């Protein structure tokens, strides 16, 4: 239940370079929320997360190679991912987006894994 997101810790914060060229598809400004979506079977790949605001307006294509360290963690419940563009400079040109993970403390090693896999921050 509530009980939950009480047991729901912050892990840490990753750097999520989303590709600028999707600014086409619709991202958003400064100090907005965005939210992480993968697919059941993307042509990137099944692991692609498809990037999308606060309105559930997909705002662009993650990266599949990124989404493929995120999408374990999504689909195996590993931690709740948030995400924000704080100064929504995928629009300029690109920038890694302030990403954070929520999830309860016996999943710890299993969300930090994926991130070890790739060589992001644990």
Do not use: C
Request: no cysteine; charged share 20%.
């Amino acid at each position: 239940g509530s009980d939950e997101e009480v047991d729901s810790v912050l892990f840490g914060s990753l750097r999520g370079h989303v590709v600028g060229l999707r600014y086409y598809t619709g991202v958003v400004n400064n100090n907005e929320m965005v939210a992480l979506q993968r697919d059941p079977n993307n042509p990137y790949d099944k692991n692609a997360i498809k990037v999308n605001n606060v309105n559930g307006n997909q705002v662009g294509h993650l990266k599949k190679e990124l989404a493929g360290a995120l999408a374990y963690i999504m689909d195996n419940k590993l931690a709740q991912i948030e995400g924000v563009v704080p100064f929504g400079a995928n629009n300029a040109f690109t920038m890694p987006l302030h990403m954070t993970f929520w999830g309860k403390e016996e999943n710890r090693k299993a969300v930090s894994d994926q991130l070890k896999k790739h060589g992001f921050k644990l």
